Design a binder for this molecule. Sequence first.
Ligand SMILES: Cc1cc2nc3c(=O)[nH]c(=O)nc-3n(C[C@H](O)[C@H](O)[C@H](O)COP(=O)(O)OP(=O)(O)OC[C@H]3O[C@@H](n4cnc5c(N)ncnc54)[C@H](O)[C@@H]3O)c2cc1C
Ligand SMILES: Cc1cc2nc3c(=O)[nH]c(=O)nc-3n(C[C@H](O)[C@H](O)[C@H](O)COP(=O)(O)OP(=O)(O)OC[C@H]3O[C@@H](n4cnc5c(N)ncnc54)[C@H](O)[C@@H]3O)c2cc1C
Ligand SMILES: N[C@@H](Cc1ccc(O)cc1)C(=O)O
Ligand SMILES: N[C@@H](Cc1ccc(O)cc1)C(=O)O
Lengths: 505, 505
Amino acid sequence: ELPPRKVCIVGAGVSGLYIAMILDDLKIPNLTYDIFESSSRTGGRLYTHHFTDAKHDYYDIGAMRYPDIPSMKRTFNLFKRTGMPLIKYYLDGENTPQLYNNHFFAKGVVDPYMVSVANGGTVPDDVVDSVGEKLQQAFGYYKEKLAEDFDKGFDELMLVDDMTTREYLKRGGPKGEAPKYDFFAIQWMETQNTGTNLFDQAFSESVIASFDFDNPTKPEWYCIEGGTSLLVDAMKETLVHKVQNNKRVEAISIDLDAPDDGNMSVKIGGKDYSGYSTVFNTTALGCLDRMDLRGLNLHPTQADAIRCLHYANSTKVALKFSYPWWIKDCGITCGGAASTDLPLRTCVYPSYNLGDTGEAVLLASYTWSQDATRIGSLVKDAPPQPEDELVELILQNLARLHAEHMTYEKIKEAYTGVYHAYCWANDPNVGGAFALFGPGQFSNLYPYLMRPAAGGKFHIVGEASSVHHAWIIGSLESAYTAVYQFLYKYKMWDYLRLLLERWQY
Amino acid sequence: ELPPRKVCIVGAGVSGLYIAMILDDLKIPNLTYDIFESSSRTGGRLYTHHFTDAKHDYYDIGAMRYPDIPSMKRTFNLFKRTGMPLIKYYLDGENTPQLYNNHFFAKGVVDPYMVSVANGGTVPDDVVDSVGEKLQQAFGYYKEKLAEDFDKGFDELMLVDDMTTREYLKRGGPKGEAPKYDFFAIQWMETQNTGTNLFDQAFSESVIASFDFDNPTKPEWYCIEGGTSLLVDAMKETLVHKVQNNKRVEAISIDLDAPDDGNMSVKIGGKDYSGYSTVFNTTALGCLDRMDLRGLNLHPTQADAIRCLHYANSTKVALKFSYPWWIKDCGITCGGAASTDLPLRTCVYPSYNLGDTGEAVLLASYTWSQDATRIGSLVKDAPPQPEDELVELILQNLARLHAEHMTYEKIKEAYTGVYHAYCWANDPNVGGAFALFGPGQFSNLYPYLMRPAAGGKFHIVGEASSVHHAWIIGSLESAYTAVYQFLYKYKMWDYLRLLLERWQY
Ligand SMILES: Cc1cc2nc3c(=O)[nH]c(=O)nc-3n(C[C@H](O)[C@H](O)[C@H](O)COP(=O)(O)OP(=O)(O)OC[C@H]3O[C@@H](n4cnc5c(N)ncnc54)[C@H](O)[C@@H]3O)c2cc1C
Ligand SMILES: Cc1cc2nc3c(=O)[nH]c(=O)nc-3n(C[C@H](O)[C@H](O)[C@H](O)COP(=O)(O)OP(=O)(O)OC[C@H]3O[C@@H](n4cnc5c(N)ncnc54)[C@H](O)[C@@H]3O)c2cc1C
Ligand SMILES: N[C@@H](Cc1ccc(O)cc1)C(=O)O
Ligand SMILES: N[C@@H](Cc1ccc(O)cc1)C(=O)O
């Protein structure tokens, strides 16, 4: 018979909720847990904002779209287990405008944006129209290996992880045997592929990004009708021990001089919570770094990983309109996204309100990196109440982006005066949007992040603690692996076998 | 004989005020200007926060310290022109603690922080105690050329501008003939030299940084007693045309069909302001990118520079204490700064309150880059009203850093309950702290940033538009050069000769 044991789950985002879900399913005798969440809200970076309780009157601030690819099977299994209402998500849609250098994209035209050397810009003529082809040449080998087997493909990709994307493109790969691109070529590739400055982060992250968004299998995409927070609701409801909100862990410790299994503790608001046999930390790493972890005696390079692994910013801005003018006036009738070099960068047309003719939400701006920091600087806790600079910027950018069909006056007139925006680097409980590692970090720092700690009783868990950054799948894989390690540590072979039987696939 | 002319100055930080100062001094017949400032406040990144009107009861949120080196002579000339009360600033002081991996630095100790491979960390033994020497070897040749002649030195440095600092250290310079360092060596150098992740930005910025902070001349440093905002006050006072605050420019244009000198205009709150013969934009580039600039017909690569040139974040946190416990109890009696891998990263002991025995301000945290974003996530426009996570974090970090003489209890007891913090990336009027360029940007994008525009009538001015990022000197040089180009364009030879006579040196 198993002795009584308690574990501690720090954070109630999807990782922490998944750990609890797995433990609840295994039903290990005399095992209990505490889940502590710093926010008044549960769900973390699963976060649907509802303007009203009307059917489609929402947008997803965090996770919103899911590609049905093999590496994400665990995510779709969670969806199935919790009865999520899935509907099609249109990554690409009809008639979505693309605007660069104040020109609209045109199929079959040489340099439609007029940015090549031939037209007075500095993008090389042989690059301006062929970003797709040239990035497929840069990323494709690795994408194919990842599709064959993600783990093996990842291990192969790590052999060039010392390079940034820019460095890879500049030098022609590891041996100089690939094409070499000049600064302006690489700049245009970045502009057409990702957020501002992100080619100066890891080549491996750009490859994995391309694998997820431009997967060789050309997958179907899905979203959750009613918002991703429906998943948080579902996971919360099954909990044998409910989330304790407004509980911010500020320290984690192990008492190595104590003989007991339950010799770990955490500190919350100056008070000790003790008796834990294992602690699963599931917070973003910036939050973890703020804790006093001296009581864990972490390897110094593991500590370095917590402080230094790079996070990217992300900002979303959603506006309500009295009618879906992008559908009715612009012929944008089935989702997709408009891309531009204007400040809003990306305008996402919702896939969940396609048949509505009344009030409708538009995800008017979705940005990463420096673009997100810049939009984020206009996003305030208490929005300007009386002129709102962000609203005016978004309306002006939307007018330019949809100029083939709309005017600023008509868009402003359709705008209801209700909007919401969110900058993830401004969230105290995350401090960024997600991990997006710098050069060398996956191959050098990440293995120390994942190093056993406190004699195998402390786990650093979450999307950053995975090879699938910025996806639910990374959070879930990280959680599963940590539960495996926990069961193994305490030699619970019956329940480890059960874990593999029920939860591996 | 000179026709009436009007110019527009966008922004009233130190660049904008300096343009006006020069124009006011040259007294060109029939020339006037408008200065439009978006904020209700004048001064921009010159910004002293006064807790009360008591003598030393302030800290500088922006610029605060000035090295007396030749390349910054124009800054000290501005100080002299305006009667600034300068006092000594102690960059290095006595008894300032350094805390890494929970160990305190001590001179002569081998691997005091226990991070060497020999002691179970991953920092190579031949690097751990010799970061200074190794970075001087990497930067030194260029620092010396910059000392001989900054312009010539810069031009030589541009020949390796394609590399990040990490890339330079990794590959052994451009030919592999310098020492090559592994990931963990470079990581430790970054940790000991700058903010988290900044070695993944331009090598040239790391060099120029080292040149300014560790100049070969071993300079005296100064600060302005009473706060840097005294300079803003003095510059405002002399203005022939006063700053117009709460005037945010949202568009800039030239009418090329009009034959007049004054064929430029700007838009503010939807209203046109016309008749300008030249427009000087002095805002941070993020603010400029948000404007509608179509009316200027900017070269596409100049537009790219505005969007893409990289900015770094910076955050400051200042606490008031009932007595200067760092002076009285820790023997830190003459300024300097404490450095640590704890979240606060750098604690700066003020140089302006050394003889005070009552209330005193401490610049408890000064951070850059990801460190600043993480502290910044706790800095709110409306500070939490009665528990503040940021305050508690700073108090706990201060206790650890000063554990040789203080306890948390004593520091908390000394804390008055009054503090202020500021994260520059969260300021709508800047959107970052300052330019800190990525690899290749100085050598490729920057020349297009500085390209003549609107037929020589539009100027992009400010610290980013200079080779001295993050210093007043960059702003002043940028302003001076733009005024030169303005006088040249309109062939005002008498006044151009006067500019050279009075303002070159
Ligand atoms: C803008 C954005 C868009 C995204 N898009 C998608 C998408 O389309 N599809 C997809 O699959 N994924 C997407 N992702 C990723 C997905 O949202 C995340 O990977 C996942 O939600 C992360 O879950 P987590 O449990 O690892 O971390 P979190 O969600 O961060 O959960 C950690 C929890 O810990 C809490 N916490 C923090 N500090 C403390 C403390 N001291 N004590 C106690 N608790 C604390 C936090 O409040 C939080 O609730 C997106 C993410 C973002 C930010
Ligand atoms: C944290 C920090 C520490 C620093 N430390 C030092 C130091 O120790 N020593 C040193 O010499 N230098 C230092 N610097 C640098 C120095 O502060 C700056 O380089 C200088 O103040 C920038 O002046 P500027 O005129 O170029 O830009 P800004 O100060 O940004 O002025 C531009 C003005 O334009 C306004 N504006 C923005 N948008 C609009 C619009 N649409 N319409 C109208 N107006 C607009 C802004 O509000 C602002 O007032 C520091 C800077 C920071 C942020
Ligand atoms: N997965 C998130 C964002 C993201 C994806 C991949 C990344 O590498 C980084 C961020 C989305 O759906 O937009
Ligand atoms: N000059 C600012 C900060 C700074 C200095 C140099 C840089 O390259 C960047 C930022 C200071 O005194 O702290």
